[PDB]
Short mmCIF file of all heavy atoms in Angstrom, two decimals:
data_model
loop_
_atom_site.label_atom_id
_atom_site.label_comp_id
_atom_site.label_asym_id
_atom_site.label_seq_id
_atom_site.Cartn_x
_atom_site.Cartn_y
_atom_site.Cartn_z
N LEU A 39 -40.04 -18.52 14.91
CA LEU A 39 -38.78 -19.09 15.19
C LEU A 39 -37.80 -17.97 15.65
O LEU A 39 -37.89 -16.86 15.11
CB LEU A 39 -38.18 -19.77 13.94
CG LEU A 39 -38.97 -21.09 13.47
CD1 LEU A 39 -38.66 -21.25 12.00
CD2 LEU A 39 -38.41 -22.25 14.34
N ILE A 40 -36.84 -18.31 16.55
CA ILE A 40 -36.01 -17.36 17.23
C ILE A 40 -34.50 -17.69 16.96
O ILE A 40 -34.18 -18.86 17.06
CB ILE A 40 -36.30 -17.26 18.76
CG1 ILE A 40 -37.77 -17.13 19.04
CG2 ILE A 40 -35.51 -16.18 19.35
CD1 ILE A 40 -38.43 -15.89 18.47
N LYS A 41 -33.76 -16.68 16.62
CA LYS A 41 -32.41 -16.89 16.35
C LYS A 41 -31.62 -17.16 17.65
O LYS A 41 -32.04 -16.77 18.78
CB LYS A 41 -31.79 -15.62 15.68
CG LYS A 41 -32.42 -15.23 14.31
CD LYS A 41 -31.60 -14.09 13.67
CE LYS A 41 -32.25 -13.73 12.32
NZ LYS A 41 -31.33 -12.98 11.50
N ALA A 42 -30.50 -17.92 17.58
CA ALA A 42 -29.64 -18.11 18.71
C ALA A 42 -29.07 -16.75 19.15
O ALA A 42 -28.63 -15.94 18.39
CB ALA A 42 -28.46 -19.08 18.32
N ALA A 43 -29.07 -16.63 20.53
CA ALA A 43 -28.57 -15.38 21.05
C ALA A 43 -27.11 -15.27 20.76
O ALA A 43 -26.35 -16.25 20.92
CB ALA A 43 -28.76 -15.37 22.59
N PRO A 44 -26.59 -14.11 20.25
CA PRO A 44 -25.11 -14.05 19.89
C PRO A 44 -24.25 -13.88 21.16
O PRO A 44 -24.68 -13.40 22.17
CB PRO A 44 -25.07 -12.77 19.03
CG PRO A 44 -26.13 -11.89 19.56
CD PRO A 44 -27.30 -12.85 19.98
N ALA A 45 -22.98 -14.32 21.00
CA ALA A 45 -22.02 -14.01 21.95
C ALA A 45 -21.93 -12.56 22.18
O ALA A 45 -21.74 -11.78 21.21
CB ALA A 45 -20.72 -14.67 21.65
N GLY A 46 -21.98 -12.05 23.44
CA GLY A 46 -22.14 -10.63 23.70
C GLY A 46 -23.23 -10.35 24.74
O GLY A 46 -22.90 -10.73 25.94
N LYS A 47 -24.29 -9.74 24.40
CA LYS A 47 -25.33 -9.27 25.33
C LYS A 47 -25.80 -10.49 26.17
O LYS A 47 -25.76 -11.63 25.70
CB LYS A 47 -26.51 -8.73 24.55
CG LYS A 47 -27.56 -8.19 25.54
CD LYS A 47 -28.68 -7.49 24.84
CE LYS A 47 -29.75 -6.99 25.82
NZ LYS A 47 -30.85 -6.30 25.09
N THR A 48 -26.13 -10.23 27.41
CA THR A 48 -26.51 -11.19 28.32
C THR A 48 -27.49 -10.54 29.30
O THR A 48 -27.61 -9.29 29.38
CB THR A 48 -25.30 -11.76 29.06
OG1 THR A 48 -24.38 -12.32 28.11
CG2 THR A 48 -25.65 -12.86 30.14
N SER A 49 -28.24 -11.39 30.03
CA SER A 49 -29.19 -10.93 31.07
C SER A 49 -28.49 -10.34 32.31
O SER A 49 -29.18 -9.99 33.30
CB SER A 49 -30.15 -12.03 31.49
OG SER A 49 -29.40 -13.21 31.88
N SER A 50 -27.15 -10.19 32.31
CA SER A 50 -26.42 -9.70 33.41
C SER A 50 -26.91 -8.30 33.86
O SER A 50 -27.26 -7.49 32.89
CB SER A 50 -24.91 -9.64 33.16
OG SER A 50 -24.16 -9.29 34.29
N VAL A 51 -27.01 -8.03 35.06
CA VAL A 51 -27.35 -6.69 35.58
C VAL A 51 -26.29 -5.67 35.39
O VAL A 51 -26.56 -4.54 35.40
CB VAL A 51 -27.74 -6.72 37.11
CG1 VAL A 51 -28.88 -7.74 37.39
CG2 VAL A 51 -26.44 -7.08 37.97
N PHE A 52 -25.00 -6.07 35.16
CA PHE A 52 -23.88 -5.15 34.86
C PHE A 52 -23.76 -4.91 33.33
O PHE A 52 -22.81 -4.15 33.03
CB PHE A 52 -22.54 -5.76 35.41
CG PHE A 52 -22.71 -6.08 36.86
CD1 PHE A 52 -22.55 -7.41 37.32
CD2 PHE A 52 -23.00 -5.09 37.86
CE1 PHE A 52 -22.61 -7.72 38.66
CE2 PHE A 52 -23.00 -5.42 39.18
CZ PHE A 52 -22.85 -6.70 39.57
N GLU A 53 -24.59 -5.46 32.48
CA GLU A 53 -24.46 -5.27 31.08
C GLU A 53 -24.77 -3.78 30.74
O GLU A 53 -25.74 -3.24 31.29
CB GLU A 53 -25.32 -6.15 30.28
CG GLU A 53 -24.97 -6.34 28.83
CD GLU A 53 -24.05 -7.53 28.56
OE1 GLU A 53 -23.93 -8.41 29.46
OE2 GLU A 53 -23.38 -7.52 27.49
N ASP A 54 -23.97 -3.29 29.75
CA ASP A 54 -24.14 -1.89 29.34
C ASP A 54 -23.98 -1.85 27.88
O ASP A 54 -22.81 -1.97 27.34
CB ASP A 54 -23.12 -0.92 30.03
CG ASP A 54 -23.60 0.52 30.12
OD1 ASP A 54 -24.13 1.07 29.10
OD2 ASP A 54 -23.44 1.08 31.20
N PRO A 55 -25.07 -1.66 27.06
CA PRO A 55 -24.91 -1.65 25.62
C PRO A 55 -24.03 -0.58 25.06
O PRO A 55 -23.39 -0.77 24.10
CB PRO A 55 -26.40 -1.52 25.12
CG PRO A 55 -27.09 -0.82 26.18
CD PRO A 55 -26.46 -1.37 27.42
N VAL A 56 -24.03 0.55 25.68
CA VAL A 56 -23.23 1.68 25.23
C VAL A 56 -21.74 1.30 25.35
O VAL A 56 -20.95 1.49 24.43
CB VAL A 56 -23.55 2.97 26.01
CG1 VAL A 56 -22.72 4.13 25.45
CG2 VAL A 56 -25.06 3.30 25.95
#
Side-chain angles (χ1 to χ4, degrees):
Chain A
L39 292 157
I40 311 298
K41 300 185 181 199
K47 185 177 180 180
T48 301
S49 52
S50 189
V51 301
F52 306 118
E53 198 92 16
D54 207 314
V56 183

